[PDB]
Ligand binder design. Sequence first.
Ligand SMILES: COc1cc(C)c(C(=O)NS(=O)(=O)c2cccc3cccnc23)cc1-c1ccc(C#CCO)s1
Ligand SMILES: Nc1ncnc2c1ncn2[C@@H]1O[C@H](CSCC[C@H](N)C(=O)O)[C@@H](O)[C@H]1O
Ligand SMILES: [Mg+2]
Ligand SMILES: [Zn+2]
Ligand SMILES: [Zn+2]
Length: 845
Amino acid sequence: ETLGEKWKKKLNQLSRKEFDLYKKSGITEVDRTEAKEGLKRGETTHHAVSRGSAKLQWFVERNMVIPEGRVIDLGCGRGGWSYYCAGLKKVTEVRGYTKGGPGHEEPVPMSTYGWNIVKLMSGKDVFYLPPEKCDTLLCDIGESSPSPTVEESRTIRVLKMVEPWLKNNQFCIKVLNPYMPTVIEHLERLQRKHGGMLVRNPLSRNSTHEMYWISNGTGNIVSSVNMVSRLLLNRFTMTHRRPTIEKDVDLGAGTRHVNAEPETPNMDVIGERIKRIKEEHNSTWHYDDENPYKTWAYHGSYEVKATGSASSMINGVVKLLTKPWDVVPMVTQMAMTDTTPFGQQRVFKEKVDTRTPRPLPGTRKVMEITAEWLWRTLGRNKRPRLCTREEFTKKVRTWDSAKAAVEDEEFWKLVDRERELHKLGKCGSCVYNMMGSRAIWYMWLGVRYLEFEALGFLNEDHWFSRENSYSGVEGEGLHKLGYILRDISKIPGGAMYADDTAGWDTRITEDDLHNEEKIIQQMDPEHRQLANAIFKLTYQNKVVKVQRPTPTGTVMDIISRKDQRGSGQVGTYGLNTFTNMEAQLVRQMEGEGVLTKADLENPHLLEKKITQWLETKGVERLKRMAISGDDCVVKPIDDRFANALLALNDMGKVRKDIPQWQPSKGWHDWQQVPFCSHHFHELIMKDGRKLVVPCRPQDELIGRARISSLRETACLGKAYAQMWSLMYFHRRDLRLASNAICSAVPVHWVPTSRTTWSIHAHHQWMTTEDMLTVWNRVWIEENPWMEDKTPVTTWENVPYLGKREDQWCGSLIGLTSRATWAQNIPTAIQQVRSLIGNEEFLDYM
Ligand SMILES: COc1cc(C)c(C(=O)NS(=O)(=O)c2cccc3cccnc23)cc1-c1ccc(C#CCO)s1
Ligand SMILES: Nc1ncnc2c1ncn2[C@@H]1O[C@H](CSCC[C@H](N)C(=O)O)[C@@H](O)[C@H]1O
Ligand SMILES: [Mg+2]
Ligand SMILES: [Zn+2]
Ligand SMILES: [Zn+2]
């Protein structure tokens, strides 16, 4: 009797209750919530049709099967394996066959990326089909049975059916029962002929001994099968472990043109950076022809140790003082952040490895005119300026590694050498990391300095301040954003629109880049030449480092791209604000009927009409906007803007979470308008004065504060408590939790570490000063929208949101557990105080 047979007898003896516990004990599982609701609403983009896409991805990620050419998918069902293959580098056609009909899954039609190369056929019994030529054979057929010999016949049947479909090609075949001796005998003969190996997918439930015969591998079937039997037997006795939750796959949207995908690198511009990386890592430098990059040019890899983690570190002090939130899913989903090479690669494939169609010639003309006008407007008072070593060094001080480098003369000597290459129109070492010795660290910081030197002026000199740019909100700060949205709401016209671009930085075109670059025209000759090196050699020819996991260990890939924004490069905020202002002006012109479909298609479009609209209405239309990077709030002259989608989608600025051609929905109540991850409420204090306050789902606030020595953990907790008291004092639970943290953390301990990296954060809470004096300075004294300067002497006079509004935005007020928490607060304070030690603490309400 095999171990698998012992496992089967035990599984069949389990009661219904203990079977439901065991089946998912310690397993990996994708969260199907979003996809199931999306499919229920009839959505055809992004969603995977079943858990199958995730299941196949696990194999593909690990190079166990690398689908390519003509893919055939036997028993495709709903199509999860097929729609996943459709977006892979080397796949040119996916033919899926499934039985369908009563008791069988039918193919679910979709518009995910590459749907156009997907051919799902129902009414196809694979056991009646003559084998076809194919480059990848996939098969996921096998119905379970309490009898293992019934499964044995089903498994041999599938094995005999698949075999003739194999001829030196890729495969991934389910083996329903691999533990029966005759199945092992059959697999051993199959491995001698076709190779491959048997692998267990962790996403498989414990109620099945299924394994997959994959083409890329070798190894001992008997040993691999028994290891699974042993794991599965051990899971019966093992104390119940909840499944490891992973984020489900994003299969994108739209048609795939395989010939449009590849990147053609400018080797004359990037060749030297590749040569130097190759030199520094010559001992492990290799060219991996099995790399997954479709739209990024690949140049080689080097071996590296793995960096990252599946989840975030939890803050113990704040968790202890926020007990009702242990049970809330959104709070724990915050900690769900996969930064492993597997996590990086998933994000790269779904978000970065895309190509935006060139905008039409009329769209390019409109953008060119708007850009020339906008830079002139932005440069009316200020002149561009070079930033310096002294400036960069000051900014760094206000990483310990960065402070060491800037104090080192060798770092500056390397910078000078690279600057001399930039002056000759050459780049030798300027690279950025998507996610991935001191020479490498110095080359990176030097790249960031040289970008800062040439383009730091846009941020440093406040080019996107509301005063300089009209639409900008730079230097404003969270507490001022709402007051600006309230002021914009006073402008008559349409609703306030707030459409987010799906991954903005990947939607930045070679045309956007050429328009952003136009600022060089206002620079002095020596500045012009340095900024022109950045734009041309580095921003329009990006050389990037990215980690990738392989069956033999982690590698660092060197990849390149001409278009898109370099997210790991300086000036991203300012360049995004500039292009978003321009794109929003173009969409306003279309909504006004100034810019037509005929204009967008016109190769010899006339500037006259656009120039008149900009010179006469431009600044007025800029004033109708609040633009902060990729994020915008637009209040147009009327609602035609909602239906104005031609120039927006043609520019490549496709809106997130909405079909391409569906009109936008806006708001007339400014307090419901989303902006920079927040919405803003207008409150009336006990004294009758009004306050405009920042707000967001309370679980996002708690969840974030719950992410990380003890002293550092307590100090970071205190920083979150003080930010809450200054910015989110109107949230009942946050003021109570803030008071609890400050009582539990030593009073003289000055908060350390940032609570956020937001450009809108001025960190007035990073102090030992009394929080009510800081509150008064922020909310009354320095507040330009507060006319009456009378201070507030008590927190009782610092207002809360209305009970219903506090509840709508996630408050737990009115729940029994929240009431128990409030009663149990002095106890939670004592527990943290006990752990910290015998220090000086104070009591807060
Ligand atoms: C516009 O203001 C904010 C926006 C965001 C996004 C954050 C913020 O970090 N949020 S986060 O931690 O949960 C988060 C982290 C990383 C990525 C995210 C992506 C989307 C949404 N959140 C993300 C903080 C602030 C501020 C907090 C306090 C402020 C103040 C003041 C007055 O001086 S400003
Ligand atoms: N004789 C047969 N011919 C064709 N398809 C069959 C079959 N016997 C079973 N099937 C189908 O095989 C499917 C297995 S489930 C397919 C899951 C899939 N890999 C995904 O990603 O969604 C079932 O839907 C079943 O209807
Ligand atoms: Mg927005
Ligand atoms: Zn360089
Ligand atoms: Zn709110």
